[PDB]
Amino acid sequence: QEMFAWKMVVLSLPRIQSQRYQVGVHYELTEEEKFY
Amino acid sequence: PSGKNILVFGEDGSGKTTLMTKLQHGKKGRGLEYLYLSVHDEDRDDHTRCNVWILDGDLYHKGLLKFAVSAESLPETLVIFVADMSRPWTVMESLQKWASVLREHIDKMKIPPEKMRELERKFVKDFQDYMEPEEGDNVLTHNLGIPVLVVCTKCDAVSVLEKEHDYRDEHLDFIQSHLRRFCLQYGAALIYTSVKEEKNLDLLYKYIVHFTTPALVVEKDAVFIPAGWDNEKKIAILHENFTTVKPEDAYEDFIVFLMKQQSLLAKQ
């Protein structure tokens, strides 16, 4: 009865590339930090 | 059976992809990585579609929680609070952080159904009544309640942790007793996991989502807190021997203008 993927398909790929909204500047656009 | 669900909460990796690989993979650095399970149902493979959602990060994950939690899916939701033992401050802060995220999810997505509130609260009050027997008084339980179970990663690194900055049973005993306190206050249990070791998660996650398991504290390195092995006395006995009884300060312990004016002044 594996046929209930509509719940995930309702909003599956609405944000496939939403990792670049850094307040338009931020001066450190990266979703992590480097070493020391 | 109906559809089962599991929400694993990774804290910046912490071996979440490796742990999900050990049970049955690209990476885990974006968020909402759906995973399917196939657990034995004591006789055959009855297609126990226990959905697993890998949530990592903090950049607007409420939408991912909305796409990962349905309305009538709420009872069979076994979230897995994952925190790696290599960074104890990350465990102490991330456990309360994921608990706060779960509280916000209940305060923003569980509130529209009215009958589910009065049914779920009594279901939790009756579920905690059966959580303590068949294991082998009253604790400061919080407001959150649903079948939960916390799983800690990097537990097979006792020598590494004592070689870096612990070098005493105070740190390991502090983490053990305090995570035990956090699990009893959150209405959960604690099952440690490791690299190709400590295979005890499937037993309790199968035992609660309706095949039993006992407690292990003798080894002190592979500690398993089952459902119903908590009180307010053994936790005090744990952090008493050489460890400060409930310290509130040990958390930070284990965690042409100038030149022109000058020329003009010289000219006068």
**Residue B129 in domain:** yes
User: Which residues in chain A have Cβ-Cβ distances shorter than 8 Å to B67?
Assistant: 7-8, 10-12
CB-neighbour burial class of residue B208 (10 A; exposed 0-12, middle 13-18, buried 19+)? middle
Residues of chain A in contact with residue B60, where contact means CB-CB under 8 angstroms, are 18
Q: Is B59 domain-assigned? A: yes
Residue B158: other Cβ atoms inside 10 A: 16
Mutate to test the interface with B, among A1, A4, A8 (most CBs of B within 10 A): A8
The chain B residue lying nearest A17, using CA atoms, is B30
SS3 for B102?
Answer: helix
Tally of structural domains, chain B: 1
Q: By the 8 A CB rule, do B144 and B101 touch? A: no
CA distance B241 to B143: 31
Cα–Cα distance list, B24 to A9, B39, B153, B204 (Å): 24, 10, 17, 18
Experimental method: cryo-EM
Q: Is residue B199 part of a domain?
A: yes
CA distance to B58, B75, B129, B177, per residue, from B125 (Å): 31, 13, 7, 25
Q: Tell me if B265 is assigned to some domain.
A: no
To what resolution in angstroms was this structure determined?
6.7
Residue B55, beta-bridge partner list:
B9
Distance of CA A17 to the CA centre of its chain: 6
Token pair recorded at residue B262: 């000058």
Task: With respect to residue B56, please indicate whether it lies within any of the assigned structural domains.
Answer: yes
Looking at the partner chain, which of B49, B63, B67 has a beta carbon nearest the beta carbon of A8? B67
Burial code (b: 16+ CB inside 10 Å, e: under 16) for B72-108 equals eebbbbbbbbbbbbbbbebbbebbebbbebbeebbee
Residues B9, B79 contacting (CB under 8 angstroms): yes
* Domain assignment of residue B1, given as a range: 1-255
Chain A contacts of B63, Cβ < 8 Å? Answer: 11, 15
Tell me if B107 is assigned to some domain: yes
The CA distance from A34 to the nearest CA of chain B, in Å, is 14
In a domain, B268, yes or no: no
- B150 beta partners: B81, B190
Distances (CA, A) of B128 to B148, B155, B161, B175: 11, 28, 34, 24
Residue type, B257: F
One-letter amino acid identity for B230? Answer: D
